[PDB]
């Protein structure tokens, strides 16, 4: 049963990255831009980084 | 079935196939302090604890792994270090141990025997002839 | 009046190497894609 | 549109370009827009001069974001091509940011350019 | 792509294809330069043949046997 | 050392192993198997698994049942082949040589690259077929069978046009088709055996579709990076270069333009006459002999891109009208000028309709004036040549000596036309200064 | 593209038929050649800086000139009447002359 919530987990986590940032999604993909968006904070906290950062 | 192969063509040995493979030292600076206390850890207990002279040319040795002792579940109330003790090196556990203060008291006496007629007396002795 | 037409020849190395030479695209398509490539209209 | 500090006199255009030209002889410039957002976030930046033609304006809007939050005057030029080739780059710069030093004329001029700026707002 | 889908605006009546068009021909742009990046050739090097000698170098001329019609039967 | 240079020749030439390593090696050579498996493996073994694989092959394709009993035999586990003479050793060269035509199609499959392992492992295939065996391997030059391939070759018996393949021996990554078209450009031989190959595979009508892009996109490639070499802007050296160029092309072009059954390589050489006429500054007559092999070359299959390519070799020579038999055969094309208006969308097919209704005008038969009229009507000349074709053909009807009244008919149709073509007529009328009304009413009365 | 300037109305941001940047210092001369087909462009701050382009198809001739053709640091251009001579001069003040043919 937690492997079945998890696996509901992640495909409600592809669709609402999918959502939020679609150009970044058709990219690298949902689970590495969570990652992103996780350790920056925020998508505008995300975007104020240079691509080096 | 039956696939077509991946074909992979393109010194000392890396880990101990006997030992059950312990990794080749990666000769970081603070192993290599931590392997000059380890052959000088007679200093370290200042005569309180006298050690076996193993005294080779070179201290490293080829394979090391730097571990930390876990439990022992039998004692746990002074045989386990507290959260403000568990340090990162070996050398850093020397430093916040006690008698730095006694390493620094036979190093000024050392330094005062080394200094004893090398050169400022005799700078002190042409300053007083000078006179 | 016209001219000899100029291509660079990254261009036509990317007509070419968009795939291997089996499952390319049929050499009507190819030659459709390269005649355009060589095309003089403006 | 979104680009509303504008510099739209061609008087006022030619000497932005020509203060980004003498501050790139200066080695006091930095082009591009990752690079204008480190210095405006590391706050080094005196001036920063935007391009209005960028095909997708919203990749250098996020620029105006961090002036606002820093207090440093930014100024739409019309044309990235002559931006470009105003810093020396033989490429098309969308956003350039140039900065302040000790003592300098250049730096003299980059007040006077701040305050010029400061009338368009 | 993260800038233009933090402060890009869209008319609300936007598709998703049309919403992600930066990620889209980046995407394809530098999958383009990936396949650049790994199908770039390797050096070239001078093919030796067995001898150590360079191979397409001619050999020493020597004259071939070759038997010819005497033409002095034809009488 | 000149011992040890002739000493080194006689090794190199020897082709049969001496000393029990070397037959150990050279038994070793294996594709499927690895070498420690393929020591221990004697002839009865290789010939049940791969005799399984072609049985596989035959049962795919029909026409391997003589090579079912001269190549595959089980009398054919125990030939060796530097045992027999030079005849024999020519004829089993040349079967061998039919066998990799007929199964280059289906190389990416397990039961042909058995099949080629029985050869490889009993015929030696490797070493004394190295050219067929590497040219009908090179269209698969992106897969690990051919890195197996370049893995067991020898290296001095692959042939000098094919030895840029040594740092690809040397560490063992497939080779890139940037690679084989500069060594394309660079070598005349190895353009030469690539198209050679597969003309000869093409004239037993082994052909595949792998094997025609790949003769077609490296013979264009390697035309136009032989074309920036040979352009030099001095003038006798760019005559020679374009003199040394067509001699190196011709023969394969001048086979491959009318091999009718083979309409896919005539296609691919429609697209290399297609690069050579645009980007290769040339002169008029070779362009008039290219589009008069290609006119007697085509088919319904290929007519289209005959079409296109005859666009673009007609709009990049210097002359305005075509050489006849062209415009003989663009009469026999069925749909010309709807054809031409779907080329014309993206070609500009001014100059082929122009030369083609110079030379319609130019012929005194009486049965080309629907096309002159649709071609004139057709909007794809321009102003001026519109209004020098209508000259021609008043003129034509000034010299003829019926045939002045189909002339006349289709004179007061081209007058009483609709457009801007109307337009340009009656302008081309009162430019060249004579009256409609004379020929009008001496052709009604 | 002087057919691309009419939108009597001129459009007020045409663009180019093809942007030349093989020189980097300051174009100094250019020329057409009379009968329009070539077109030599020139900038006089570098040593031999002179690309010669064909008409209609904006390509630099990549054959001429070449790194030991004796141009200097051109100062003036001159197509000949029939296009048939092309004289440069520079600032060293000598003049010499290229048959054009094609």
Redesign the interface.
């Known amino acids: 049963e937690r492997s079945e919530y998890r696996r509901q987990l992640a495909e409600y986590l592809q669709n609402r990255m999918?959502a939020?940032?679609?150009?970044?999604?058709?990219?690298i993909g949902a689970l590495v831009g969570a990652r992103?968006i996780a350790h920056s904070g925020s998508?505008?906290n995300?975007?104020?980084?240079?691509?080096?950062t | 079935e039956l696939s077509v192969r991946v074909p992979q063509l393109p010194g000392p040995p890396d880990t101990l196939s006997d030992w059950y493979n312990i990794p080749r030292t990666n000769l970081t600076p603070e192993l290599k302090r931590d392997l000059q206390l380890l052959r000088m850890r007679d200093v370290v207990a200042m005569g309180k604890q006298f050690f076996k002279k193993d005294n080779r040319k070179d201290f490293v040795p080829e394979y090391c792994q730097v571990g930390t002792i876990i439990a022992g579940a039998t004692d746990g109330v002074s045989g386990r270090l507290t959260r403000k003790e568990r340090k990162r090196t070996i050398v850093e556990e020397v430093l916040s141990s006690d008698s730095v203060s006694k390493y620094k008291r036979k190093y000024h006496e050392i330094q005062e025997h080394k200094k004893s007629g090398r050169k400022g007396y005799y700078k002190k002795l042409m300053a007083a002839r000078k006179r | 009046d016209t001219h000899a037409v100029v291509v660079a020849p990254q261009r036509l190395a990317e007509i070419f190497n968009a795939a291997p030479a089996f499952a390319m695209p049929p050499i009507e398509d190819v030659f459709y894609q390269v005649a355009s490539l060589f095309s003089t209209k403006p | 549109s979104a680009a509303w500090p504008k510099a739209e006199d061609p008087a006022l255009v030619q000497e932005l370009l020509d203060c980004v030209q003498q501050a790139s002889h200066y080695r006091q410039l930095k082009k591009g827009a990752?690079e204008t957002?480190?210095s405006v976030?590391r706050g080094t930046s005196e001036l920063v001069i935007l391009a209005a033609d960028t095909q997708p304006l919203s990749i250098v809007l996020?620029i105006p974001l961090?002036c606002e939050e820093k207090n440093v005057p930014y100024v739409y030029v019309p044309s990235k091509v002559a931006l470009g080739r105003a810093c020396g780059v033989s490429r098309a710069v969308i956003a350039v940011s140039l900065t302040s030093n000790e003592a300098s004329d250049l730096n003299s001029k980059i007040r006077a350019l701040r305050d010029k700026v400061e009338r368009l707002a | 792509?993260?800038?233009?889908?933090?402060?890009e605006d869209f008319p609300e009546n936007a598709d998703?294809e049309t919403?992600?068009?930066?990620?889209?021909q980046?995407?394809a742009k530098?999958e383009n330069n990936l396949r650049l990046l790994e199908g770039k050739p390797l050096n070239k090097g001078v093919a030796l043949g067995p001898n150590g000698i360079p191979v397409g170098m001619p050999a020493k001329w020597d004259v071939k046997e070759a038997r010819k019609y005497n033409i002095e039967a034809d009488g | 050392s000149s011992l040890a240079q002739q000493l080194a020749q006689i090794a190199a030439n020897s082709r049969s192993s001496f000393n029990v390593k070397a037959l150990k090696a050279s038994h070793s050579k294996s594709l499927i198997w690895e070498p420690r498996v393929a020591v221990s493996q004697t002839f009865a073994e290789i010939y049940s698994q791969c005799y399984e694989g072609f049985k596989e092959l035959c049962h795919l394709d029909s026409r391997f049942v003589p090579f079912d009993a001269t190549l595959f035999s089980a009398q054919s586990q125990e030939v060796d082949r530097t045992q027999m003479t030079a005849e024999e050793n020519a004829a089993l060269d040349k079967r061998v040589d039919s066998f990799l035509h007929l199964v280059g199609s289906r190389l990416r499959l397990m039961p042909a690259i058995k099949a080629v392992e029985w050869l490889i492992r009993r015929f030696r295939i490797h070493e004394f077929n190295t050219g067929t065996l590497l040219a009908t391997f090179l269209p698969y030059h992106t897969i690990p069978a051919f890195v197996t391939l370049l893995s067991i070759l020898p290296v001095q018996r692959i042939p000098i046009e094919y030895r840029f393949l040594d740092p690809y021996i040397k560490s063992l990554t497939p080779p890139p088709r940037a690679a084989i078209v500069q060594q394309a450009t660079n070598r005349p031989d190895l353009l030469s055996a690539i198209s050679r190959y597969t003309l000869d595979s093409c004239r037993a009508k082994q052909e595949y579709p792998g094997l025609i892009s790949f003769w077609g996109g490296i013979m264009a490639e390697a035309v136009n990076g032989m074309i920036d070499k040979m352009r030099s802007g001095r003038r006798a050296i760019q005559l020679e270069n374009d003199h040394l160029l067509l001699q190196q092309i011709g023969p394969v072009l001048s086979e491959a333009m009318v091999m009718k059954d083979v309409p896919g390589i005539q296609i691919a050489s429609y697209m290399v006459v297609a690069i050579l006429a645009a980007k290769g500054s040339l002169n008029d007559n070779i362009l008039t002999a290219f589009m008069e092999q290609l006119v007697h070359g085509w088919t319904v299959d290929t007519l289209r891109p005959g079409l296109v390519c005859l666009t673009m070799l007609a709009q990049h020579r210097s002359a305005k009208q075509l050489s006849g038999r062209v415009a003989k055969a663009v009469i026999k094309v069925p749909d010309l000028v709807s054809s031409l208006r779907d080329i014309s969308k993206e070609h500009q097919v001014d100059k082929l309709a122009n030369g083609l209704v110079l030379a319609f005008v130019d012929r005194g038969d009486i049965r080309t004036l629907p096309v002159i009229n649709s071609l004139l009507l057709s909007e794809l000349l321009q102003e001026k040549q519109a209004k020098v074709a209508y000259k021609a053909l008043l003129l034509a009807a000034h010299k003829i000596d019926n045939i002045r009244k189909q002339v006349g008919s289709a004179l007061v149709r081209l007058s009483q036309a609709e457009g801007d073509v109307g337009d340009a007529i009656r302008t081309a009328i009162q430019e060249v200064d004579f009256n409609i009304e004379e020929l009008e009413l001496k052709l009604g009365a | 593209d002087r057919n691309d300037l009419i939108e009597i109305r001129i459009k007020k941001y045409p663009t180019p038929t093809r942007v030349f940047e093989q020189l980097t210092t300051s174009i100094s001369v250019v020329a057409f050649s009379p009968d329009g087909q070539l077109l030599a462009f020139g900038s006089q701050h570098k040593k031999d800086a002179l690309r010669l382009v064909h008409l209609p198809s904006c390509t630099v001739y990549r054959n001429w000139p070449t790194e030991q053709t004796p141009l200097g640091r051109v100062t003036a251009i001159a197509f000949s009447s029939k296009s048939d001579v092309l004289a440069v001069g520079n600032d060293v003040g000598r003049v010499r002359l290229w048959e054009i043919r094609g």
């Not at chain 1, 939020?20 to 990219?27: A, D, G, K, R």
């Not at chain 5, 792509?1 to 402060?7: H, K, P, Q």
């Not at chain 5, 919403?19 to 889209?24: Q, S, W």
Request: proline share 5%; net charge positive.
């Open positions: 999918k939020i940032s679609p150009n970044m999604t058709e990219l992103l998508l505008v995300l975007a104020k980084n240079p691509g080096s | 990752n957002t480190k976030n996020h961090i | 792509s993260v800038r233009t889908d933090a402060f998703d919403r992600a068009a930066v990620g889209i980046a995407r530098l």
